Paper text:
The capsaicin- and heat-activated receptor, TRPV1, has served as a model for deciphering lipid modulation, which is relevant to understanding how pro-algesic agents enhance channel activity in the setting of inflammatory pain. Identification of a pocket within the TRPV1 transmembrane core has provided initial clues as to how phosphoinositide lipids bind to and regulate the channel. Here we show that this regulatory pocket in rat TRPV1 can accommodate diverse lipid species, including the inflammatory lipid lysophosphatidic acid, whose actions are determined by their specific modes of binding. We captured several states of TRPV1 ranging from channels in which the VBP is empty to those bearing different bioactive lipids, including distinct phosphoinositide species, brominated phosphoinositide analogs and a pro-algesic lipid, lysophosphatidic acid (LPA). Together, our data show how the VBP accommodates a range of bioactive lipids and how occupancy of the site corresponds to the structural status of the pore.
Through symmetry expansion and focused classification, we captured LPA bound within the vanilloid pocket in multiple stoichiometries, ranging from apo to all four subunits occupied. LPA displaces the endogenous PI lipid by occupying the upper region of the pocket that binds aliphatic tails. As in the case of vanilloid agonists, Y511 flips toward the VBP so that its hydroxyl group forms an H-bond with the ester carbonyl of the LPA tail. Moreover, S512, T550 and Y554 engage in H-bond interactions with the phosphate moiety of LPA, while the free hydroxyl of the glycerol backbone interacts with N551. Therefore, the RTX headgroup may be better suited for priming this salt bridge interaction as compared to LPA, which may help to explain the greater efficacy of RTX as an agonist. Together, these structures demonstrate that LPA utilizes similar molecular interactions as vanilloid agonists, such as RTX or capsaicin, for binding to TRPV1 and initiating gating. Reorientation of Y511 toward the VBP is a key step, allowing L574 on the S4–S5 linker to partially occupy the now vacant space, thereby facilitating movement of the S4–S5 linker toward the VBP. Movement of the S4–S5 linker enables the S5 and S6 helices to move away from the pore axis while providing space to accommodate a π–α helix transition in S6, which is associated with the loss of hydrophobic interactions between M682 and the S4–S5 linker.
Residue numbers in the entry:
A (entry chain A): 198 to 603, 627 to 752
B (entry chain D): 545 to 603, 627 to 703
C (entry chain D): 198 to 408
Write the structure that this text describes.
């Protein structure tokens, strides 16, 4: 299944410069593609992806001299913009082959720089990076989507120190006075592009992305997010928090003063209190419907994978569940049923406990809520299955021992046994049985076992994470804030392009073509006393 | 009188160990109490409002009494059967159990957080703050 | 808003010794101050503070040779006690520019030592450190107030090992017998001064002080 393989590829692989020159002397083709299954992305665990072109194979295989020879041969010039069947060019292959390792990262960035420089020199009139594959992803977009931290870090901080190619670089130095110099970063296709932006791609990427958390440590991204926040998202978020708090207060007041006559609905009397109760109930139902509709809209827009449904979107799912409880409550209320009380109280508790979603926006409280989320996700089930097994087993044993009476039911005995965990056990809660020794032994064994269980719980989740929580929680909180910022920006387009990324700047003034250019720079200031 | 008796700790400075202890108390009361109490109060108030809404009438129909009973779970004196004047015992039990589990999780991440982030700084930062205190 | 900027400052910044010599050969002024907003303390995030004088700019910019040339030129002697509009001298600028980093700390202490030695040699009759700015803070007091740990640590443990300048140092060795030697530390304006003492300044400083 090696169809499409050519001897030129084999020669290039063997690092044989002279043999490659001899092979291409007769006029060996260079645009031939290897469509064999062995050269595909992931069809079968064995394989190797190299872009399906000989020049891409040379580029990805640590042969810069061969790349130069292929690009600047006098026999048959090698096309640099050629797009393979999957639409991936040299840059796409370089992005793919990276594994986010220091040595490999340095290799890939060096090769990317060299190939970009050669392409610019050969055909300066042709824009290279802006191109897209069949998937419609730019090389920067592809790197961001695949989580290649090194490639993205290099691209966002490109700096070329030789003439006639400064326009390629994304970082420029406006000036340098004394030990302090200002720097400019290019924000083209970063925040808003209407097709795919780096911030949008990184934000909405699934957790399967290797390094989604720390990719925001990049300097321009972090500073841009902070600036956007402090510019307008802080005010918008605070207003939203205030509105939601008013909603929750109104809902609590309406629910607390519910009438007690039975068989709803209830006719409203001509009194001020009844009017206030009715308007509060209407507002609560309206808010519930609004939350339900927003949740449905989000679910259609994003379409989670049903596997990361909980790890990602942990707050939207909870809000949607609260809204569902509200809708069930109203449906039962109009159906002349008295279970709307149960549904309403569940919704009310969920709503009050969902106020933690707004902790993000304050560093400490945000980290606290993030830790709560992480536990509820990845520890609760594992550390609760064991405890429930123990509790159920010992409760079944005790209830089997008991002859008859109030506690002969399994549920009551389970409740009494669970009372030991909250510091209210009895050890003498019944006497209708035989063999008091067996009863006492069972209860003491249960107590000792559950205490041992909790002790290894805490030992485990303290030892395995006392170090990661130092910065991992902060990184997750920063990601959370980024999600909030992007959602707030996209949702509130009513204010047009209010509070744009930055001002308009002229960094180079002239490109190789006579026409001038601007790159929507983002001014940044730093100081470096040493290494002038 | 209570404030005066509890302010005797100001004189612990002058003894290294007791001074460090009082300094740690001060640091917590300043930079952790509000952050770790807002969340707990939100949870407690929400669940108390839910339970009191569920209850029909009786001694515990007031919000304050229900809040007190729910808070009693934190000091190891909860009841889980403190009232029977309501309907849907399943809902009541689920609410109380969820509250208990959530508050225990809350305290566990409390301690994990303030242990992990400062098990190392307290080695000398508290001593330095105590020395500054003594200088003052 | 660069008013007060002079070509001499630009030449000094570019680390051009020969060009500076040519510029000062015609009689370029040295006491001119740059009052432009760009050279102010913190008016606008961009900027850089250097004492508002060319000699202070050279001192803060890692040019010891240029400092020596300016101080001991035969064309126009450079005043070392000159006080700018804000009342900050060379020592005050050196204190300001420190960021409490090992490399920067070593740089600033070395430059401070060199400038102090040169000032002592040029005009030994003039006391230098005791002077105060408009804020009324001595260089040691300024360093303590701003929390510059490195500068204060160096000043409190100054030791000069060449003749005719031992009086400048604050640390002295009374004697040294075997492997044990006694040391003396100068406590002038440290605990009680009636205006501003190092202990008083550090004690009552707000928590905003870095260290
Ligand atoms: C039949 C359903 C059983 C649950 C009945 C109601 C009690 C549920 C209490 C909330 C359970 C979820 C626990 C939780 O973690 O929510 C607290 C929030 O900070 C979570 O983060 P977020 O702000 O909502 O995004
Ligand atoms: C309406 C006011 C509510 C408080 C009513 C009285 C109960 C207050 C108990 C003291 C609250 C402060 C807690 C505290 O930390 O004080 C203990 C001292 O070691 C603190 O350090 P210091 O020696 O006083 O300087």
């Amino acid at each position: 299944y090696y169809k499409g393989q050519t001897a030129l590829h084999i020669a290039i692989e063997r690092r044989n410069m002279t043999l490659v020159t001899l092979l291409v002397e007769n006029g060996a083709d260079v645009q031939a593609a290897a469509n064999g299954d062995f050269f595909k992305k992931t069809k079968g665990r064995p394989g190797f992806y190299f872009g399906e072109l000989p020049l891409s194979l040379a580029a990805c295989t640590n042969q810069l001299a061969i790349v130069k020879f292929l690009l600047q041969n006098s026999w048959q010039p090698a096309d640099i913009s050629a797009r393979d069947s999957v639409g991936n060019t040299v840059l796409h292959a370089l992005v793919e082959v990276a594994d986010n390792t220091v040595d490999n990262t340095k290799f890939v960035t060096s090769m990317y720089n060299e190939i970009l420089i050669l392409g610019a020199k050969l055909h300066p009139t042709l824009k290279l990076e802006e191109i897209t594959n069949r998937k419609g992803l730019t090389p920067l977009a592809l790197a961001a989507s695949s989580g290649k931290i090194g490639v993205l870090a290099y691209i966002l901080q490109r700096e070329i120190h030789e003439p006639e190619c400064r326009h390629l670089s994304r970082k420029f130095t406006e000036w340098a006075y004394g030990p302090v110099h200002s720097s400019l970063y290019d924000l083209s296709c970063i925040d808003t592009c209407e097709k795919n932006s780096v911030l949008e791609v990184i934000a909405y990427s699934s957790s399967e992305t290797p390094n989604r958390h720390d990719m925001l440590l990049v300097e321009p991204l972090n500073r841009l997010l902070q600036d956007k926040w402090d510019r307008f998202v802080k005010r918008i978020f605070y207003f939203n928090f205030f509105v939601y708090c008013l909603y929750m207060i109104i809902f609590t007041a309406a629910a607390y003063y519910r009438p007690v006559e039975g068989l709803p609905p209830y006719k409203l009397k001509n009194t001020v209190g009844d009017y206030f109760r009715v308007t509060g109930e209407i507002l609560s139902v309206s808010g519930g419907v609004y939350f339900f509709f927003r949740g449905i809209q989000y679910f259609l827009q994003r379409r989670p994978s049903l596997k990361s449904l909980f790890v990602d979107s942990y707050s939207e799912i909870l809000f949607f569940v609260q809204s569902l409880f509200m809708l069930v409550s109203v449906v039962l209320y109009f159906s002349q049923r008295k279970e709307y009380v149960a549904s309403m109280v569940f919704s009310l508790a969920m709503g009050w406990t969902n106020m933690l979603y707004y902790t993000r926006g304050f560093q400490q409280m945000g980290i606290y809520a993030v830790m709560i989320e992480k536990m509820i996700l990845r520890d609760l089930c594992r550390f609760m299955f064991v405890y429930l097994v123990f509790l159920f087993g010992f409760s079944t044993a005790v209830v089997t021992l008991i002859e008859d009476g109030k506690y002969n039911s399994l549920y009551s005995t389970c409740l009494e046994l669970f009372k030991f965990t909250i510091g209210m056990g009895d050890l003498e809660f019944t006497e209708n049985y035989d063999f008091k020794a067996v009863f006492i032994i069972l209860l003491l064994a249960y107590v000792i076992l559950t205490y041992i269980l909790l002790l290894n719980m805490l030992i485990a989740l303290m030892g395995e994470t006392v170090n990661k929580i130092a910065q991992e929680s902060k990184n997750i909180w920063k990601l959370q804030r980024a999600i909030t910022i992007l959602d707030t920006e996209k949702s509130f387009l009513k204010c047009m392009r209010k509070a744009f990324r930055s001002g308009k700047l002229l960094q180079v003034g002239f490109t190789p073509d006579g026409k001038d250019d601007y790159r929507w720079c983002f001014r940044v200031d730093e100081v470096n006393w040493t290494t002038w």
